[PDB]
């Protein structure tokens, strides 16, 4: 039925057309924040945090981490059916979860913090990471198969003081799991030549803006560096969690990222939380050390504020942006599908677009003009060998919504 995007699927329309050939279907029906979606091998992992009252200043009511199957719901439309749910005892201590599928389970790596979000209280946070393993098909009377909690004791960080999962989902290679992650490096140990800051033709930029933008504020104690957290399951005895820093090609501040397999190769997306507002994604050259051949995309960006609005390419000192990933659905033409926010300085107007590096092939809005939106997570797969995509979109009971979009074969309705 539902399988991974691998092999050689049905044709997708490769021409650019204004025709309405994308038909999004809503498959989902007090605030709900911090969402997480992952789709792998016909299964899915989902997570959220339900708060009471406000979304930012509200009390944490319940943290949900579940897994299940992606099935044909009946009318040839894929949907998600929960099969195994888990809730921590204190919802306000679990942060920054990231789910990676392997064979029988989803392994979700989360951070444990009694000082709030480690991104906003980095220096105070004492690094504590947990692993919750959830079976995609639970079995009765089966011990720790269905749900298993593992407090991670051994972590190798290299030059970084602290490391944390930072992204919705990672990949598996053989028996080794890789989670999107970030490392906190003190600015005193941050060796960066300002010569590498691309200030050319930028009238009001300074070569210092890159290094200062590598932190949440210009005087931050840490800089954030994206990368991977590696967990080798073959080393069964006690598995060390190893940090792998991302290469410094087109370096931007550590931000929520995603590594996913598509057409049998790894692809990486990194959210643009700084001055480089054009979308950052591409095929992975090497996983260890992590280097990504970023696409030179000139059509997809993200909303910002005053300093770094959408389409900005000059280095400024800013920490602003949103996570809006994209899934590669055709490597031979490097075509991708994802939801972007169609606004320069406000997080709003979600639009699902199928696009190449230098052109948007075809798109469709997901809500009215004034509708506010935030993080979006898009994962694509095959249903009876037609490419489908499921997108989680935060939208303003403030709660996320899930859409299923089939990628059409022809360019006319």
């Amino acid at each position, epitope marked *: 039925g539902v399988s991974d995007l691998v092999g050689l699927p049905n044709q997708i329309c490769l021409q650019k057309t204004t025709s309405t050939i994308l038909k999004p279907r809503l498959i989902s029906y007090v605030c709900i924040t911090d969402p997480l979606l992952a789709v792998d091998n016909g299964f899915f992992a989902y997570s959220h945090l339900e708060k009471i009252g406000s979304c930012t200043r509200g009390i944490a009511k319940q943290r949900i981490i579940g897994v299940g199957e992606v099935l044909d719901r009946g009318d040839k439309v894929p949907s998600m059916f929960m099969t195994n749910v888990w809730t921590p005892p204190n919802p306000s201590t679990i942060h920054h979860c990231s789910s990676t599928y392997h064979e029988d389970f989803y392994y979700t790596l989360c951070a444990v913090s009694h000082v709030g979000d480690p991104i906003l209280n980095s220096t105070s946070w004492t690094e504590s990471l947990s692993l919750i393993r959830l079976a995609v098909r639970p079995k009765s009377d089966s011990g720790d198969y269905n749900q298993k909690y593992i407090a991670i004791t051994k972590v190798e960080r290299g030059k970084y003081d602290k490391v944390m999962p930072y992204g919705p989902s990672g990949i598996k290679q053989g028996d080794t799991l890789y989670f999107p992650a970030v490392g906190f490096l003190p600015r005193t140990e941050f060796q960066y030549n300002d*010569s590498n800051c*691309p*200030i*050319i*033709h*930028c*009238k*009001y*930029s*300074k*070569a210092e803006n890159c290094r200062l933008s590598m932190g949440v504020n210009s005087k931050s104690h840490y800089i954030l560096r994206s990368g991977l957290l590696k967990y080798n399951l073959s080393l069964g005895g006690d598995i060390i969690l190893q940090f792998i820093e991302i290469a410094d090609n087109r370096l931007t501040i550590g931000s929520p990222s995603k590594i996913y397999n598509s057409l049998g190769q790894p692809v990486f997306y990194q959210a643009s939380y700084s001055w480089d507002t*054009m979308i950052k994604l591409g095929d992975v050259d090497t996983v260890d050390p992590l280097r990504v051949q970023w696409r*030179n*995309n*000139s*059509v997809i960006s993200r909303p910002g504020q005053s300093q770094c609005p959408r*389409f900005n*390419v*000059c280095p400024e000192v800013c920490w602003e942006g949103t996570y809006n990933d994209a899934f590669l659905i055709d490597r031979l033409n490097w075509v991708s599908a994802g939801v972007y926010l169609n606004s320069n300085q406000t997080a709003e107007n979600p639009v699902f677009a199928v696009f190449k*590096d*230098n052109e948007i092939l075809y798109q469709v809005p997901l809500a009215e003009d004034d509708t506010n939106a935030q993080k979006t997570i898009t994962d694509c797969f095959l249903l009876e060998n037609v490419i489908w995509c499921i997108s989680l979109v935060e939208i303003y009971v403030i709660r996320p919504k899930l859409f299923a979009v089939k990628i059409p074969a022809q360019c006319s309705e």
Partner: antibody
Amino acid sequence: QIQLVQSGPELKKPGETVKISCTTSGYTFTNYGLNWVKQAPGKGFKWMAWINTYTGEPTYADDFKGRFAFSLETSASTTYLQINNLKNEDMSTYFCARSGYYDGLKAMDYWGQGTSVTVSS
Amino acid sequence: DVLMIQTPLSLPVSLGDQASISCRSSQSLIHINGNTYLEWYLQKPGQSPKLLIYKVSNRFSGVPDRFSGSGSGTDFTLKISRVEAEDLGVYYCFQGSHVPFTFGAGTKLELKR
């Protein structure tokens, strides 16, 4: 009335230092940056650097790090290219050209007349 | 490194003919801002170069309409419809999309006899 004028020809021995000037007139100096380009005799052009006349910060190619220095004086509306520890591979004709910021046209529309630098013992 | 390959290095043409110079890049010259900073310059003997064409196809001030530019991504062409004697010289393509900015080897437009 837009014109860029460079310093005269230079004849130097290996190891010495040369400083080529490029004085511009006829436009607002800070509204367009400058490009330094190098042409070897009977050969092609090599882009050396681009200087931001508003901030003073240059962006140079990797081959021209170290003994090359790209500075400017805003009062005189001049940019300077200084080469230290001259070697034979520096003998060439050096041009300055007007290259705009992203706010307009970054193409090299107005050029200097060029400055020849001969290096020999 | 981004490489600019010009064809041909020497282009003998009779006066009043059409000339075509091809420039191909090792990587796409479409910057991530949508612009393709491919420029064509001309240099006459004993003269500083002169900007002919900017952004693939736009003509700089004072350039005759007989000069035109076309292409996209990695393939570009400069075209002279009817070559007057004032066009004899050396034509260079140039890319300003990736640092370090690079030139072509050049094409010598000379007179056939």
